[PDB]
Design a protein around this ligand. Structure first.
Ligand SMILES: C=C/C(=N\C=C1\C(COP(=O)(O)O)=CNC(C)=C1O)C(=O)O
Ligand SMILES: C=C/C(=N\C=C1\C(COP(=O)(O)O)=CNC(C)=C1O)C(=O)O
Lengths: 459, 461
């Protein structure tokens, strides 16, 4: 219904356009050629995945992790906050370092810093812009940056525009690769050996595409061994930790008691906190560096009063414990899914033959917590078939494919939210087991859902 | 005013003497570079917000923030959507699209005469998306040297390997850049790649206006095959320029001649955000190739509702009186200052320079941006003089502008008054006479009175 119409519109958007542009102006011809590159791999994006918003599919795909958007709970606190300031000055006035600073945003920043165990907080209009500010303003000429290969797009962008001339990736979440990257970097830079410059380590506390967790404590001990003079600093992107991990949602750094061991933290508002924005946490030196050397921040308008107030409302709900039941339900639902799927009659065979692969589901019991992110893998030649199967079963997931990941690394990403139900998880597990069975049957002799999409294409 | 100045003074005191782990020591060393030129930024210029100084400083050009007019429409908009879904859901191309934001985009496009619109959280992000998604390999970009920081950043991250600046607002320089770029690229000569031209409608730190009609004629001359596209950054034009605030492009009837336009919400529209305007091909290019957009959360409902409210105020004519009042007040300032007894002498000697005030009468309209120059060695003294007179302005210095090109930026707002302009004119004339007097007295160590007070407070703390 809505699923089929969203899917027909998607199919039509992949039809090549350059053959109809032969007499158009050069400028538009060449843009439609560039769009045709993405169309030619059925990867052109247009209107996204929205069947869940109309209730026509289960939401196993959105970033509304605590369901604070879905329930209106954030909206009600946001409106309460605006009602406590009936004469509020909506407009900031300009740049945060020119006409745009004001008492309310500084007070809200300090509330958040205090709740999260940091000396200061600086507000941005997104997590992406916070990472841009960090890696353009913080690294010094002669510094080196050592980063997990799977840091966010905005970190890669920020590092590429950085003053630091040494940037080293290491294999994702691999402690031996981290040690080798640190060792090799320290040993090849005289200014790092003598301690006149620093190694900046960039990690995510929870990884957007894989759902695993940064071994922060272990990486800190390694950093101290390779850098006896202490000339290093960690930067932790907690986009997918805040609200989900730790008591009252303080995130992974505070949960591990590392708030004084991590120089820079980024906590964003676009996922569990159900709005937009972010704060960068650090001491006054870090904050003043951002205000003076992050060109991106200097040259943009400071947040309006409503944008600050909605962030305060999110933190209000967290700080007062109003989110703890939802945060706990994520844990329950995710483990509920792990137990159900790994207990299915087909789980062993499908994992053996490579038909299904859910790495976060392996050894989840040896974890102090699970995360809301469940990437699900099949054979690379089956990935669209898996998505089509879930889609036609009215389960909304996000397909992950080139250009978001390399060709041949495609998957689907299931997001488990606080407002999901055990019945929905039951339906997800059954639906997954159907797909696994259909493929096991085919290999021992096109799946039905793909047949259906391919029929729509032929139409 | 004094508390702001004291805090500013202390912030310039060198910290590295006390510095400490390597990481923090090197940071405060970098901060000390700014402190040593008394140019560290911290809390900005805010004395006007509490009424302790006149606002000749802020970007609240139509006074929609000051009057509460935007706030009231924004809250009425929210009340008309009592069950609104606050959270977008994710990225605009994944979980974060929804009907309300698509409808508000199209309403803004229709108001501005464009085919389609795409919403961003800022004008900066809009420019980042444009220059990272739109230029193709083999294209050239020809840009005014004074485009915005975000445009410089985006162009550096561009796939275009030819990028050519031209001298600010200079039609001869533009023609030279276009013709030399055409003359050296065979694929521009044969029409198979494009020249992208990047300008601002109204220039943030200079207040002059792009001669857009004249640039389009030159482009058509140099590119007879039509293989060019204009990109107009209208940050300082929406709300202030054109009938009902539609901006410069629409004022000139060039909606179909300028392929890409940026209209931002952080100035006259008194909030935050932007839209990029163009046809569906342009919009699809941003959605697919601007990684900054693909990898960020789509706007919340209130962020879209406050922008809708600002455009609804404009489209219902509720900003036209304020827009006309800016024009009156700026022209009133120009007539007053250029009528001052000391004007001719101060401008001849270079004690005062206000280029936008010369030949203002021959303009079809004026802008709110009034950059005021003195001698470079007096610019902080000028700011001190205004600040102590309880007049708030923004002091502009490197890195915002090149070394040796510092100035102060007055912004005129609909909410200002002729009496406030009178006091500004008088304060500027006092400053001019005092500095003329010092220069003629032959005592090279003599400090003006405002700067004396600042130096006294520095001596204390
Ligand atoms: C675009 C949504 C999204 N990813 C966003 C992240 C950001 C950007 O934050 P925002 O600009 O949206 O505020 C910074 N770091 C990390 C680790 C992220 O996952 C997702 O669907 O996972
Ligand atoms: C933020 C301060 C400000 N200038 C902002 C401009 C931007 C960025 O817009 P935002 O990111 O703030 O939305 C793009 N283009 C132009 C021409 C601008 O003047 C000013 O005080 O001049």
């Amino acid at each position: 219904g809505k699923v089929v119409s969203e899917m027909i519109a998607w199919i039509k958007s992949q039809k090549l356009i350059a053959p109809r542009m032969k007499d158009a102006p050069t400028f538009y011809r060449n843009l439609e050629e560039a769009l045709d590159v993405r169309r030619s791999t059925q990867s052109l994006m247009t209107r996204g995945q929205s069947t869940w918003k109309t209730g026509d599919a289960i939401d196993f795909c959105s970033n509304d992790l605590l369901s604070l958007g879905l329930t209106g709970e954030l909206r009600r606190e946001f409106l309460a906050e605006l009602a406590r300031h009936p004469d509020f000055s909506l407009h900031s006035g300009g740049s945060r370092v020119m006409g745009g600073n004001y008492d309310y945003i500084e007070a809200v920043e300090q509330e958040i810093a205090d709740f999260l165990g940091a000396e200061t907080a600086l507000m941005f209009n997104s997590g992406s812009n916070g990472n841009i500010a960090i890696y353009t303003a913080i690294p010094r000429p002669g510094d080196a940056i050592v980063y997990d290969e799977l840091v966010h797009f905005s970190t890669h962008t920020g590092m590429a525009a950085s003053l630091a001339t040494t940037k080293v990736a290491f294999r994702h979440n691999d402690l031996d690769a981290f040690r080798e990257a640190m060792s090799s970097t320290m040993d090849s830079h005289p200014m790092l050996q003598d301690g006149s410059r620093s190694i900046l380590v960039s990690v995510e506390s929870v990884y957007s595409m894989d759902g695993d967790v940064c071994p922060l404590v272990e990486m800190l001990e390694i950093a101290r061994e390779i850098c006896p003079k202490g000339n290093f600093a960690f930067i932790a992107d907690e986009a997918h930790a805040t609200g989900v991990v730790g008591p009252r949602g303080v995130g992974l750094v505070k949960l591990l008691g590392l708030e004084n061991e991590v120089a820079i933290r980024l906590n964003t508002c676009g996922k569990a906190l159900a709005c937009t924005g972010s704060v960068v946490l650090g001491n006054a030196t870090v904050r003043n560096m951002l205000l003076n050397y992050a060109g991106s921040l200097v040259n943009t308008t400071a947040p309006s009063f409503p944008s600050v107030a909605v962030i305060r409302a999110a933190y209000n709900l967290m700080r007062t414990g109003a989110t703890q039941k939802a945060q706990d339900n994520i844990q329950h639902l995710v483990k509920y899914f792990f137990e159900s799927i790994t207990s299915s009659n087909i789980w062993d065979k499908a994992t053996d033959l490579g038909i299904l692969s859910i790495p976060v589901a392996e050894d989840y019991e040896s974890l102090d917590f699970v995360t809301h992110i469940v990437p699900i893998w099949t054979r690379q030649k089956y990935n669209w078939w898996l998505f089509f199967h879930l889609q036609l079963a009215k389960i909304a997931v996000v397909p992950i494919d080139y250009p978001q990941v390399p060709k041949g690394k495609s998957r689907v990403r299931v997001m488990i939210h606080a407002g999901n139900t055990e019945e929905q998880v039951d339906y997800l597990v059954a639906t997954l087991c159907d797909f696994a069975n259909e493929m096991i049957d085919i290999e021992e002799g096109i799946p039905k859902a793909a047949q259906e999409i391919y029929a729509l294409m032929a139409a």
